[PDB]
Amino acid sequence: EVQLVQSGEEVKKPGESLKISCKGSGYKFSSYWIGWVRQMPGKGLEWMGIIFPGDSDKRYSPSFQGQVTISADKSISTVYLQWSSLKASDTAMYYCARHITTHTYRGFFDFWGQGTLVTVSSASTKGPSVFPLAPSTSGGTAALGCLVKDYFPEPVTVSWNSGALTSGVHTFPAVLQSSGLYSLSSVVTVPSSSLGTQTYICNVNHKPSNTKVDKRVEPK
Amino acid sequence: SLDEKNSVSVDLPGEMKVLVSKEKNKDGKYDLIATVDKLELKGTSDKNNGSGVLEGVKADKSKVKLTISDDLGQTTLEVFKEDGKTLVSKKVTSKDKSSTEEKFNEKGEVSEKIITRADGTRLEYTGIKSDGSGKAKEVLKGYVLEGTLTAEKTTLVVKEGTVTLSKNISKSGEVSVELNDTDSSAATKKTAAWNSGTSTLTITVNSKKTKDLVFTKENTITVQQYDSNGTKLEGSAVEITKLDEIKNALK
Amino acid sequence: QLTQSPSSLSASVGDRVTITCRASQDISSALAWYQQKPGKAPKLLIYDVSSLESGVPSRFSGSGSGTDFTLTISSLQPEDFATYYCQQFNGYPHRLTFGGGTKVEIKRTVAAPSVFIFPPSDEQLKSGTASVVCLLNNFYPREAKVQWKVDNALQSGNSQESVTEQDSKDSTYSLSSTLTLSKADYEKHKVYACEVTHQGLSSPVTKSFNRGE
Ligand SMILES: [Cl-]
Ligand SMILES: [Cl-]
Ligand SMILES: [Cl-]
Ligand SMILES: [Cl-]
Ligand SMILES: [Cl-]
Ligand SMILES: [Cl-]
Ligand SMILES: [Cl-]
């Protein structure tokens, strides 16, 4: 039954405060160390601190002490992690996790929350612009696609021909541009013989801005 | 289901024995069984030497795990709660009969520690609290010294009338012995000087040395009397064997 | 203090796989192993060097001594393709350190990329910015080098790359490289070219076009 349920996704601006939470279930919450672990985009795992909910005893990682505050509310079986003033470099996935530990012999996490995605950036919500990538043979293969540029925050989703075209599709992970906006591409390889009779429409959806775009990709 | 006929018995540290199957089961592995404190622990291993991991479940639902070093020179006996992960108790025993046993609380902190030396003497720390204090007890051949542990030191105490003898043990672990007399008569008050270089406490009465108490590296105590003028020691030094005799030496 | 050595490892369903973790000093039995899949939380596999967590399959095994530890998977299954992390603990004061991670990926025969290049769209140019896109499609292994040349001059600092996860059906990767220029800079040059290197190509493959057509 052991279950750690974290609070939902956050998009904040630098200098704002933030407190995220984690609620446990299926065990005696006040009797186990519980802790927080950071995973920055594309990187590994870093421990932040642990707390014992029974009496709010705290052990922080050096290199995070004085940067964040960990607290607990035993009465609702929730542990919190809080920043007074976030920085863009706090953009990361944050995990809550139960901690098994004994004296100096062992310390590890046996159950993990699902994760809280925290985005911190000066950017404001912006829907993407979609640009075609047009195909340029006879019995050969052509490539076409759509470039989905300059949106915030993540994610967008891309289908082709309203979901009827799946074979050969590659939608790339988004990239953060120096401007601070995300960009991605989605591509398909198709038989040259279908061009000019089979139509190709990319469908782009960006929920945070309520933007839906369908772009026909035509040859030459 | 291992018998004299189908297995071999292997002696282990901690006065234990493992039976090891002579024939591998399917999985190509040897079965192991070992009895400790009324439970039959079972496991499997690729070796047939007697090394490996064996486990069981107690009547209170605790999970027990015994690890035997590949050398048969060190066993580790652990007791967990139902979850198989939260530690209740761990004991490490070597071929030389030395061992260390500990108990832990909810937070993983040590709440009891038993240290057993090769000779058989023990240091016993019970009721350890978060502030680092608890009851203390050193078990020697022929007597037991009782006292207290504190974050600064372990202190064991022997009382005979007005005279209290304290054996201190720092966190580093070198012994220091003091004596204090409640008797306020200058003619009969016992005082003591401690020489660390020789682990000897010299007792004085009426500005004349009377006895030397040597606290030896073998965890024994010896006593030797000065002559009646308090200048040179006399004859042979006796090894203490009973609590009574330490009390006589303080009279 | 904790170095995870294989870093990337290629194997097939049914293979024997070994991942190693070397500690800078002895750590006794204070070592644990986790698995993580993209988008998902880590999962505990092994703790106390060799102890198997409830509900993890028996094909997982851990071992080690002072500073060398190994995680073994008897017979790889498809749900086992993932990233694995070792993790150590020290006690005075409390400290937890994770390894750098080992990605275990599906082994297949080397596949050269097919390369396509896309000029900026006329619609994008009205916006003031130009993006040139180079696609490397369906190659293996994942390592590849893309280089942009503009009037035969090698570029640096104005491109960004993205790569897919390994494909579920054919086990290949795809990669996009995007060269970002202002429109006025783009309209100053003629030949735009991306040059691709990969183990499956005996010599670099260039795809190019002349601004205009
Ligand atoms: Cl094409
Ligand atoms: Cl990026
Ligand atoms: Cl529409
Ligand atoms: Cl004894
Ligand atoms: Cl006593
Ligand atoms: Cl600490
Ligand atoms: Cl740390």
Q: Please name which of C176, C175, C169, C94 lies closest in space to residue C131, comparing C-alpha atoms.
A: C176
- The DSSP element (H or E) to which A114 belongs, if any, is none
Query: Total structural domains in chain B?
Result: 2
Q: Give distance in angstroms: CA of A100 to centre of ligand 7.
A: 16
> Which residue type does B81 have?
K
Distance CA A214, CA B70 (A): 67
- Residue where the block lists tokens 């989605």: A186
Supply the CATH number for residue B110's domain.
Answer: 3.90.930.1
Q: Quick one: three-class SS letters along C50-75?
A: CEECCCCCCCEEEEECCCEEEEEECC
The C-alpha torsion from B23 through B29 and B34 to B38, rounded to 10°, is -110
Residue B28 resides in a domain: yes
Give me the residues paired with residue C32 across strands. Answer: C87
| DSSP helix/strand/coil, C183 | helix
Residue A29 with chain B: CB contacts under 8 Å: none
Supply the CATH number for residue B10's domain.
Answer: 2.40.128.160
Same domain for B223 and B121: yes
Mutation choice for C interface testing from A40, A51, A146, A170 by most C CBs within 10 A: A170
- Fold of the CATH domain C2-106: Immunoglobulin-like (2.60.40)
Report the alpha-carbon angle A42-A43-A48, nearest 5: 135
The string of DSSP codes covering C4-51 is E--SEEEE-TT--EEEEEEESS--TT-EEEEEE-TTS--EEEEETTTE
User: At how many Å resolution was this determined?
Assistant: 2.2
Question: How many other CB atoms sit within 10 Å of the CB of residue B19?
Answer: 21
A3-120 and A129-216 in the same fold: yes
Q: CB of B217 within 8 Å of any CB in chain C? A: no
Eight-class DSSP state of A209: G
Domain boundary among B20, B51, B86: B86
Distance CA B239, CA B223 (A): 7
**Residue A101 exposed, middle or buried by CB count within 10 Å (0-12, 13-18, 19+):** buried
Distance CA B10, CA B49 (A): 8
- What Å distances lie between residue C116 and A139, A141, A145, B7, C190, CA to CA? 17, 10, 11, 70, 18
Domain boundary among B29, B59, B86: B86
Distance CA B14, CA B97 (A): 7
Phi then psi dihedrals of residue A179, to 5 deg:
-60, -20
Question: How many other CB atoms sit within 10 Å of the CB of residue C133?
Answer: 22
Q: Which residues of B151-176 are buried (b: 16+ CB within 10 A; e: fewer)?
A: eebbbbebeeeebebbbbbeeeeebb
Q: CB of C137 within 8 Å of any CB in chain A? A: yes
- Sign of the Cα pseudo-torsion (A1, C95, A103, A56, in order): negative
Give me the residues paired with residue B139 across strands. Answer: B122, B144
**Residue A212 exposed, middle or buried by CB count within 10 Å (0-12, 13-18, 19+):** exposed
Q: Please name which of B120, B171, B164, B119 lies closest in space to residue B146, comparing C-alpha atoms.
A: B164
CATH 2.60.40.10 domain span(s) along chain C: 2-106, 114-210
Q: Which residues of B95-134 are buried (b: 16+ CB within 10 A; e: fewer)?
A: beebbebbbbebbbebbbbbebeeeeebbbbeebeeeeeb
- Residues 98-127 in C contacting A (C-alpha not used; CB under 8 Å): 98-101, 114, 116, 118, 121, 123-124, 127
Distance CA C175, CA C188 (A): 27
> Which residue type does C47 have?
Y
Contact A200, A161 (CB under 8 A): yes
The C-alpha torsion from A187 through A190 and A195 to A197, rounded to 10°, is -110
Ligand with smallest separation from the Cα of A103: 6
- Give the minimum alpha-carbon distance from A14 to chain C in angstroms, rounded to a whole number: 25
Eight-class DSSP state of B107: T
Distance CA B171, CA B149 (A): 10
**Residue A160 exposed, middle or buried by CB count within 10 Å (0-12, 13-18, 19+):** buried
Distance CA B245, CA B248 (A): 5
Report residue B132 as tokens.
Answer: 């680092």
Q: Please name which of C161, C198, C195 lies closest in space to residue C179, comparing C-alpha atoms.
A: C161
Distance CA A159, CA B193 (A): 90
Domain spanning A3-120: CATH superfamily: Immunoglobulins (2.60.40.10)
Same domain for B129 and B74: no
Domain boundary among B86, B109, B141: B86
Q: Please name which of A88, A151, A92 lies closest in space to residue A121, comparing C-alpha atoms.
A: A88
Contact C22, A75 (CB under 8 A): no
- What Å distances lie between residue C17 and B214, C35, C46, CA to CA? 61, 14, 15
Distance CA A167, CA C13 (A): 24
Contact B240, B223 (CB under 8 A): yes
| DSSP helix/strand/coil, B247 | helix
Full residue range of the structural domain in which residue B48 is found = 1-86
Domain spanning C114-210: CATH superfamily: Immunoglobulins (2.60.40.10)
Distance CA A209, CA A128 (A): 9
Report residue A55 as tokens.
Answer: 């009496």
Domain A129-216 carries which CATH code?
Answer: 2.60.40.10
Report residue B134 as tokens.
Answer: 């608890």
Q: Please name which of C28, C79, C26, C31 lies closest in space to residue C51, comparing C-alpha atoms.
A: C31
Q: Please name which of C7, C82, C90 lies closest in space to residue C40, comparing C-alpha atoms.
A: C82
Q: Which residues of C70-87 are buried (b: 16+ CB within 10 A; e: fewer)?
A: bbebeebeeebbbbbbbb
Same domain for B82 and B25: yes
Contact C46, C32 (CB under 8 A): yes
Residue B91 resides in a domain: no
Same domain for B144 and B126: yes
Distance CA C156, CA C177 (A): 12
Q: Is the CB of C178 less than 8 angstroms away from the CB of A183? A: yes
- Chain B's closest residue to C48, CA to CA, is B85
Same domain for B211 and B110: yes
Distance CA A156, CA A163 (A): 15
Q: Give distance in angstroms: CA of C134 to centre of ligand 1.
A: 11
Contact C84, C56 (CB under 8 A): no
Strand B238-239 and strand C2-4: the pairing is: unpaired
3-state DSSP percent of chain C in helix, strand and coil, to 5: 5, 50, 45
Upper half-sphere CA count for residue A45 (Cβ side, 13 Å): 33
Question: How many other CB atoms sit within 10 Å of the CB of residue A87?
Answer: 11
Q: Is the CB of B87 less than 8 angstroms away from the CB of A33? A: no
Radius of gyration over every alpha carbon of chain A, rounded to an integer in angstroms: 23
> Which residue type does C184 have?
A
Distance CA A161, CA A144 (A): 13
Contact C174, C136 (CB under 8 A): yes
User: Where are chain A's structural domains?
Assistant: 3-120, 129-216
- Chain B's closest residue to A30, CA to CA, is B106
- Give the minimum alpha-carbon distance from A114 to chain C in angstroms, rounded to a whole number: 6
Residue C180 with chain A: CB contacts under 8 Å: 177
Same domain for B173 and B152: yes
Separation of CA A14 from chain center: 18
| DSSP helix/strand/coil, A194 | helix
**Residue B49 exposed, middle or buried by CB count within 10 Å (0-12, 13-18, 19+):** middle
Q: Please name which of A82, A173, A172, A183 lies closest in space to residue A123, comparing C-alpha atoms.
A: A183
Report residue A86 as tokens.
Answer: 């976030």
Report residue C99 as tokens.
Answer: 């390894």
Counting as contact any 3 or more CB pairs under 8 A, the partners of B are A, C
Distance CA B59, CA B63 (A): 10
The C-alpha torsion from A4 through A7 and A8 to A13, rounded to 10°, is -140
Strands (E) across chain A are located at 3-6, 10-12, 18-25, 33-39, 45-52, 57-60, 69-73, 78-83, 92-102, 106-112, 116-120, 129-133, 141-151, 157-160, 169-171, 175-176, 182-191, 201-206, 211-216
